[PDB]
Amino acid sequence: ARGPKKHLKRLAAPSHWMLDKLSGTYAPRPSAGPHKLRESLPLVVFLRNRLKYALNGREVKAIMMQQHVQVDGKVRTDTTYPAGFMDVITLEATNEHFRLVYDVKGKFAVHRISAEEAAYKLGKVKKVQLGKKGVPYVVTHDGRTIRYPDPLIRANDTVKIDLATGKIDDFIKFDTGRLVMVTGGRNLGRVGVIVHREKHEGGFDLVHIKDALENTFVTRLSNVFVIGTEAGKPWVSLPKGKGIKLSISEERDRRRAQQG
Amino acid sequence: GISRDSRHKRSATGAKRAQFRKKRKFELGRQPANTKIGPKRIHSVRTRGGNQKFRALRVETGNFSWGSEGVSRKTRIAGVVYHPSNNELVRTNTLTKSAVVQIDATPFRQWYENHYGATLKRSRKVERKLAARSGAAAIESAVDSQFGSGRLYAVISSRPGQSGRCDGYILEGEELAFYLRRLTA
Amino acid sequence: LTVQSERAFQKQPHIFTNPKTKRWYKDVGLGFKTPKAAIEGSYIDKKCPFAGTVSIRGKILTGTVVSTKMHRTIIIRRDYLHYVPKYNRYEKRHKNVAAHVSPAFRVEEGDVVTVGQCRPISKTVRFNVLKVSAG
RNA sequence: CCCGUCGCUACUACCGAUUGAAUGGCUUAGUGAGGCCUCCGGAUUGGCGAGAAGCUGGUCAAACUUGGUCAUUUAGAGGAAGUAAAAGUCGUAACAAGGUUUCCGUAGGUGAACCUGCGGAAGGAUCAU
RNA sequence: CGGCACCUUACGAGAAAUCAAAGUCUUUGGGUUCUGGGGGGAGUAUGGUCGCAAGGCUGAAACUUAAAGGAAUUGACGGAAG
RNA sequence: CAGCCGAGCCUUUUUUACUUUGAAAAAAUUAGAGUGUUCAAAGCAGGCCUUUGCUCGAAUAUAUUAGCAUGGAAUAAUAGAAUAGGACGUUAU
RNA sequence: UAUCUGGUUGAUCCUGCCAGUAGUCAUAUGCUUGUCUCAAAGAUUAAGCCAUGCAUGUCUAAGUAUAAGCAAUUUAUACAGUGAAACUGCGAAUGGCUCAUUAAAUCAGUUAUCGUUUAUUUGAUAGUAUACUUGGAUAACCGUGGUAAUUCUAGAGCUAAUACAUGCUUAAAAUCCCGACUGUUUGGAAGGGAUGUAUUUAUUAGAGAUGAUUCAUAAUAACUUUUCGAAUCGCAUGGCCUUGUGCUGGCGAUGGUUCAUUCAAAUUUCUGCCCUAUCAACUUUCGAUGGUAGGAUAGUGGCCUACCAUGGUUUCAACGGGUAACGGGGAAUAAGGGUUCGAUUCCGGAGAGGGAGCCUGAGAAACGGCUACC
RNA sequence: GAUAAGGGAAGUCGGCAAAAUAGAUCCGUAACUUCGGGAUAAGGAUUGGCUCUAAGGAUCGGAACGAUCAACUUAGAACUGGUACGGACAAGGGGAAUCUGACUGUCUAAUUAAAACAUAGCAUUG
Ligand SMILES: CC[C@H]1CN2CCc3cc(OC)c(OC)cc3[C@@H]2C[C@@H]1C[C@H]1NCCc2cc(O)c(OC)cc21
Ligand SMILES: [Mg+2]
Ligand SMILES: [Mg+2]
Ligand SMILES: [Mg+2]
Ligand SMILES: [Mg+2]
Ligand SMILES: [Mg+2]
Ligand SMILES: [Mg+2]
Ligand SMILES: [Mg+2]
Ligand SMILES: [Mg+2]
Ligand SMILES: [Mg+2]
Ligand SMILES: [Mg+2]
Ligand SMILES: [Mg+2]
Ligand SMILES: [Mg+2]
Ligand SMILES: [Mg+2]
Ligand SMILES: [Mg+2]
Ligand SMILES: [Mg+2]
Ligand SMILES: [Mg+2]
Ligand SMILES: [Mg+2]
Ligand SMILES: [Mg+2]
Ligand SMILES: [Mg+2]
Ligand SMILES: [Mg+2]
Ligand SMILES: [Mg+2]
Ligand SMILES: [Mg+2]
Ligand SMILES: [Mg+2]
Ligand SMILES: [Mg+2]
Ligand SMILES: [Mg+2]
Ligand SMILES: [Mg+2]
Ligand SMILES: [Mg+2]
Ligand SMILES: [Mg+2]
Ligand SMILES: [Mg+2]
Ligand SMILES: [Mg+2]
Ligand SMILES: [Mg+2]
Ligand SMILES: [Mg+2]
Ligand SMILES: [Mg+2]
Ligand SMILES: [Mg+2]
Ligand SMILES: [Mg+2]
Ligand SMILES: [Mg+2]
Ligand SMILES: [Mg+2]
Ligand SMILES: [Mg+2]
Ligand SMILES: [Mg+2]
Ligand SMILES: [Mg+2]
Ligand SMILES: [Mg+2]
Ligand SMILES: [Mg+2]
Ligand SMILES: [Mg+2]
Ligand SMILES: [Mg+2]
Ligand SMILES: [Mg+2]
Ligand SMILES: [Mg+2]
Ligand SMILES: [Mg+2]
Ligand SMILES: [Mg+2]
Ligand SMILES: [Mg+2]
Ligand SMILES: [Mg+2]
């Protein structure tokens, strides 16, 4: 109606932000950016609701206006900047590096990483095509455009971005046996290897994935993210739980043993 | 104003539809350019997204292509001789797309004679180059005959009310024979 | 029946036959075979899936032809059972879908055709015939 | 026990001359603001250009008058009902073979119930000679 | 074999009278058409349609009302029989 | 030892409907796990010997016609070889 | 809690309703009311009418400061701190409210854009065949005012830009066309033009992507009331000597073409809406269904025009009428199946007294914008 | 025999007389009905001139095509003018009701044309 919306009602916010109902009428509307609104995590949510460094939105803005927060090695001062999957957030004042990777419960884990691993990131190739003057380029899942990619790189592949020069270190071809994290649907956050890709021309290709505990699930290729060349060899540190889904009874047993 | 919405029509079953909402700006139309022949007069139109369209209200010349020869030249437009949509556009000389027009033949005759040497003082190398181009210099009879009148048949390919250009290609082959039959009747 | 029956010359756009007739066609994909009447024919149809500029994408439907009285357009009847949960039973219902048929196909009322979705090519036509089974 | 005219009171709805009345939507025709596009125009104002008022023809089209139609309310002399109230007048049609068995369809007649003809039914007063 | 019926019983049904279907229905489902939803107002008013007409078919509402009704029992009564 | 499902071989070995499973399916609301808001309605908190910090969480089901993908072939439809214009010859001429 | 009870009779068993009974995230009202937590609330009738006040403004070191403003003399005689007024930019198209219209419409789930526009964010992307830096306006300001009256403004005099309008600076080749001369068996050539990117055609690759394209991209010939390839702003001030205002250069603001991305938008496939036949035929003059060409649009499309066919929907309920009808998530009650409700905390739609038309802008047919009628 | 400001039947027994309407094309058309009508109901729009366009045929030739010849009808468009145009002529006013005769028809030549006569239909008589 006459133009873009600028507000986000609290109840209409993505559920994986884990916002409380009664704290207010509105929720942080993520800005336009590398990641989609529904699949992002604004820095205000990360710094106040997750890390609890800031006590309120005034404080998260005070933190970010002092140039502390970096996303993918670049300073961001937008409190609603849409950080997303595989993004690296650096707070060198506290000497902390985080990567936004889904945990098996469907949420963005607070996943601390070493400084050496915080120097790169992975990106799922969305499309490969030719730019002006016949220069090929790759579009990753976070909207990055890398020119002159390896001519072997195709869609659904994973590239390793140097994240300081923006170049491609090396890549992983999408194929059977590759380590995968699921980035959408009800299997979001699970980690396994590709068992069989079932093609459907004009429809949605389906990928069969086997967990490390030999559990098999099916998910859309659009929800499939290659993160490693084989089982047990991920190119990034996995969050606690290793993307292994436990039943609610198993979780209850594990909590009973963990707590006594 | 002019609206392109489908709400005002009656359904495929014939039922009249009730009025759903007021006319929206993203479904507007505007008025035809009705391009004539005369000294160039072009008005810009501010379109959706801040883009620009050009209403050619009057044009004299255009870019016309000889497809077989692979050459394009800017030439005057003499008049509209045939229009498959409405004969009143022929009567009033209104330039739209797919209008059959007569264009000045001089730039193409000049290119042809300079390129091949025939009709419709040189060095030895130039004469040899022309001799090499010979054999391919024989064109269709129906096209050759027009050069006597100095005016070639062409069909407008651009949309003058959209781009401000009145461009086209020279009629050839069975398409030319088709419109020749249409003209003579 | 002649190809050049209109006030304008009928031809495929930007397909040039140099005098000093070349036909363009394409396969529509989704495992549908291009009829040889399209590869080898002479009709001109901008709305044909195989020789025209339309593309097949979206839904693939099948139905029974109930009308061929329009030029290059048919109406197919799709029969289905609608479930009424209160009575735990069904009722017969139907919907009429208008589809474009290219001259590469010959259809009569009673045939079963497979139509693929295309861009709106008329007020009521959004489907375009891809396959015909005689009835 | 009980039926119907007739008489009193009250209420509800109906028909009804009045080419009755009022309110709202849609619409033919006529008239038609205004914007937009276009056509000239050329106050004045920079060095051929910019350009206001206005003008031509279109386009979208509010709004008014008449007519038509749809819809919702409402008056009415008089006419003809229904119900409630009390069991007032006249009779006694039904319930017993209710004193002419009753009832149905149909058609005449008549203060009223009703009576009569024709053909049916038993829900008969006969499951039977 | 087909009919028109009848007699007995009640497995069974039914409120009962009664019913070989009015049974095989709370142990509820063989197929299918029509009709009813307390008594009146009322098969009336209105609109439509058929009819020469008489009328047929379709068909309300306001209002009013605590019963109306079915089968059977005992008694009372009968210008019914014994 | 029986029983219950799944298999795999050997025995001459066209269109649906239906049903299974899956993918994708907003939150709030509903059901429901955890959690002494002093109880509760709620909320999504919270807990640790008292912490220049450590640390469980924020589950899970349901949606249901339609569409998509999928396993099954009972039940109910549909088509085929009758003027043969029928089927196979994979390397038949 | 898968429940019933009173009323027809002298008594009986039924049919059957009336009455009783409980709940309501269901309203009103009467009587009554001590505490804690939580909390709806001018929807219904009148999308009826409104006094008054407020509800949308906005400046960083980084667009423009000669305030005849304040403040201090300081690294500063171009300015330098702070800072009204104005110009410029952006926002005002979000939010909030309401439910009048609306019955294949909205909406829900599910699709599509190989059918389009997209400010902004985020990635990429431009050496292209007067320069030590171009002009002339205007506001604020000063002072002359006119009107009873308004967020009215008029003459005259100044003056700025990231406002407005223009304009150069550059690699190395190489390729193509014309071609004086020349070689003279067809080669060499002086001299002229053209190369980036946008626009619009025509003709060629496309035998890297897609299920699929006339896709991406490239090439040839031209075209264009010629798009833009920075005449901008703050802080630091470094390096090389050929010590000349010499040559070079660090972190940033803002901006810019195209592609991608994101926030969106517009159309769009399939199936699904309550009562009514005392609504059975409807649509098609003057678009109804389809074909061809065009116009218009951001783009598809009878969206509109011209010509041509005679089509399209319907007892599987079309069309018409009613709705005390915005749709859905949901709500009440509930053995199961159901019945009833949903103006209303979220999502979609629509409207801003009734209509209609527009300006600006990426975005509005906007109403705390304008124009006209009622 | 014409015309007439403003009003518009107030005139008169009474709209008597006059006026208004009028051709053609297209649109639209109620009650009632003996279903045939009512009906030109009512009520609207257009119409000139000029310049064009389209459609509608015949006979020959072996042909969905050529040759030759030919009549005025209809439809559309542009332009044009003191908005005029069935330009003179020609040419319905209309509607709602009551009484009455069914209708077409007939008579009092020279004061009455009617509701009178006749009529079809119905009935009676010889
Ligand atoms: C010279 C002839 C005219 C003269 N004008 C002068 C103006 C005038 C104006 C009038 O009014 C404006 C008017 O009113 C009537 C009459 C006149 C007379 C009438 C006369 C002819 C006429 N005479 C009497 C009757 C009659 C019969 C006919 O057969 C007939 O045919 C030839 C004609 C006549
Ligand atoms: Mg809003
Ligand atoms: Mg796809
Ligand atoms: Mg059925
Ligand atoms: Mg109505
Ligand atoms: Mg009696
Ligand atoms: Mg009697
Ligand atoms: Mg007697
Ligand atoms: Mg008697
Ligand atoms: Mg008698
Ligand atoms: Mg007698
Ligand atoms: Mg018996
Ligand atoms: Mg019997
Ligand atoms: Mg009843
Ligand atoms: Mg009783
Ligand atoms: Mg209200
Ligand atoms: Mg409210
Ligand atoms: Mg309401
Ligand atoms: Mg109001
Ligand atoms: Mg209301
Ligand atoms: Mg209303
Ligand atoms: Mg913004
Ligand atoms: Mg088109
Ligand atoms: Mg078309
Ligand atoms: Mg309907
Ligand atoms: Mg409403
Ligand atoms: Mg409720
Ligand atoms: Mg609702
Ligand atoms: Mg509702
Ligand atoms: Mg609602
Ligand atoms: Mg609500
Ligand atoms: Mg809302
Ligand atoms: Mg609006
Ligand atoms: Mg308001
Ligand atoms: Mg208004
Ligand atoms: Mg507003
Ligand atoms: Mg408005
Ligand atoms: Mg307001
Ligand atoms: Mg007078
Ligand atoms: Mg007068
Ligand atoms: Mg008058
Ligand atoms: Mg008078
Ligand atoms: Mg008088
Ligand atoms: Mg008098
Ligand atoms: Mg008198
Ligand atoms: Mg007279
Ligand atoms: Mg008339
Ligand atoms: Mg007479
Ligand atoms: Mg006489
Ligand atoms: Mg006499
Ligand atoms: Mg007389």
The full 3-state SS of C58-85, as one line of letters, equals CCEEEEEEEEEEECCEEEEEEEEEEEEC
Determine the Cα angle at C101 with ends C96 and C104, to 5°.
155
B171 touches chain C (CB under 8 A): no
Identify any residues that bridge with A209 across adjacent strands, giving them in sequence order. A194, A217
What is the C-alpha separation between C42 and C13, in angstroms, rounded? Answer: 14
Chain A residues near residue C60 by CB distance under 8 angstroms: 202
Q: Which of A235, A229, A231, A205 is nearest to A219 (CA)?
A: A205
Pairing of strands B168-170, C60-70: unpaired
Ligand 11 center–CA A54 separation, angstroms = 116
How far, CA to CA in Å, does A195 sit from each of A155, B146, C132?
Answer: 19, 71, 38
C60 Cβ contact list (under 8 Å, min separation 6): A202, C30, C114, C115, C116, C117, C130
Which residues, in sequence order, are CB contacts of B166 under 8 Å at separation 6+?
B35, B56, B59, B61, B62, B77, B95, B101, B156, B158, B160
CA nearest C75: which of C8, C126, C19? C126
Asked if B32 and B161 touch (Cβ cutoff 8 Å), the reply is yes
| DSSP helix/strand/coil, C126 | strand
CA distance A108 to A47: 13
Is residue B68 less than 8 Å (CB to CB) from chain C?
Answer: yes
- What is the spatial distance between Cα C94 and Cα A254, in angstroms, rounded to a whole number? 56
- The shares of helix, strand and coil residues in chain C, as percent rounded to the nearest 5, are 5, 35, 60
Chain B: give the shortest CA distance to residue C24, in Å: 17
Q: What letter would DSSP give residue B16? A: P
CA distance B53 to chain C (A): 24
Give how far the C-alpha of residue A87 lies from the chain's centroid of Cα atoms, to the nearest Å.
6
Cβ contact B182–C7 (<8 Å): yes
- How far apart are the C-alpha atoms of A182 and A106, rounded to whole Å? 10
Q: Among C105, C99, C98, C72, which residue's Cα sits nearest to residue C6?
A: C72
Q: How far is the CA of B10 from the C1' of E39 (A)?
A: 52
3-state secondary structure chain A: CCCCCCCCEHHHCCHHHCCCCCCCCECCCCCCCCCCCCCCEEHHHHHHHHCCCCCCHHHHHHHHHCCCEEECCEECCCCCCEECCCCEEEECCCCEEEECCECCCCCECCEECCCCHHHCEEEEEEEEEECHHHCEEEEECCCCEEECCCCCCCCCCEEEECCCCCCEEEEECCCCCCEEEECCCCCCCCEEEEEEEECCCCCCCEEEEEECCCCEEEEEHHHEEEEEEECCEECCCCCCCCCCCCCHHHHHHHHHHHHC
Task: Give the strand pairing for A88-91 and A96-99.
Answer: antiparallel
How many angstroms separate the CA atoms of B26 and B38, rounded?
33
Angle between helices B173-184 and B141-149 (to 10 degrees): 60
10 Å CB burial of residue B142 (0-12, 13-18, 19+) is middle
Question: What number of other Cβ atoms are within 10 A of residue A124's Cβ?
Answer: 23
A72-78 long-range contacts (CB < 8 A, ≥24 apart) are A72/A121, A72/A163, A73/A119, A73/A163, A73/A164, A76/A43, A78/A31, A78/A43
Cβ(B12)–Cβ(C124) under 8 Å? yes
The reply to whether C57 touches chain A by the CB within 8 Å rule is: yes
Q: Which of C23, C32, C21, C26 is nearest to C53 (CA)?
A: C26
Taking the C1' atom of every nucleotide in all shown strands and the CA of C93, the nearest one is G316
Which among B166, B139, B118, B161 is positioned nearest to B67, based on CA atoms?
Answer: B139
Give which of B9, B96, B172 to mutate to test C binding, by max C Cβ within 10 Å. Answer: B172
Q: Residue B148 Cα, ligand 10 centroid: separation in angstroms? A: 119
**Shortest CA to C1' contact from C2: nucleotide:** H64
What is the number of residues in chain B? 185
Helix (H, G, I), strand (E, B) or coil at B163: helix
Taking contacts as CB-CB distances below 8 angstroms, the residues of chain C near A201 are 29-31
Q: Which nucleotides of F are covered by protein (CB under 7 A)?
A: 14-18, 22-28, 33, 43-45, 56-60, 64-69
Chain-chain contact of C9 with B68 (C-beta, under 8 angstroms):
no
Contact between chains at C18 and B84 (C-beta distance less than 8 A):
no
Give the three-state DSSP class for B150: coil
Residue of chain A nearest C32, judged by CA positions: A201
CA distance C17 to chain B (A): 9
Burial B70-105 (b: 16+ CB within 10 A, else e): eebbebbbbebbbbbeeeebbeebbbbbbbbbbbbb
The pairing of beta strand A158-161 with beta strand A224-230: unpaired
The b-or-e profile of A131-158 (16+ CB within 10 A means b, else e) is: eeeeeebbbbbbebebeebeeebeebbb
Residue C97 near residue C110 (C-beta atoms within 8 A):
no
Residue from A236, A238, A240, A41 nearest A119 by CA: A236
Kind of pairing, strands B52-59 and C60-70? Answer: unpaired
Amino acid at A179: L
Q: What share of chain B is helix, strand, coil (3-state, %, to 5)?
A: 30, 30, 40
Instruction: Using the structure block, give the residue that is written with the tokens 């036959």.
Output: C17
Any chains having at least 3 CB pairs less than 8 A from chain A are: C
- Residue A124 CA to residue A153 CA, distance in Å, equals 11
Q: Do C57 and A202 touch (CB under 8 A)?
A: yes
How far apart, in whole angstroms, are the C-alpha atoms of residue A188 and residue A38? Answer: 14
Å separating the CA of residue B145 from the C1' of nucleotide G258: 46
Tokens 């193409």 sit on residue: B108
Q: Are strands B36-37 and B52-59 parallel, antiparallel or unpaired?
A: parallel
Tell me the nt nearest to A23, Cα to C1'. Answer: F43
d(CA A219, CA A28): 30
Q: Which of B68, B161, B166 is nearest to B111 (CA)?
A: B68
The neighbour count for residue C25, using CB atoms within 10 Å, is 19
Record the tokens describing residue C5, joined without a space: 């029956």
Contacts of C37 (CB under 8 A, 6+ apart): C103, C104, C105
- Phi then psi for residue B106, to 5 deg, are -60, -45
Strands (E), C1-135: 60-70, 73-84, 89-100, 112-117, 125-133
- Ramachandran sector of residue B152 (left: φ over 0; alpha: ψ -120 to 50; beta: rest): beta
Q: Tell me the nearest-neighbour CA distance from B147 into chain C, angstroms.
A: 18
Contact C20 B136 (CB under 8 A): yes
Q: Which chains touch B (3 or more CB pairs under 8 A)?
A: C
At residue B43, what is the residue type?
Answer: H
Query: Which of C42, C33, C37 has its CA nearest to residue C15?
Result: C42
Q: Which long-range contacts (CB under 8 A, 24 or more apart) does B41-47 make?
A: B42/B164
Structure-determination technique: cryo-EM
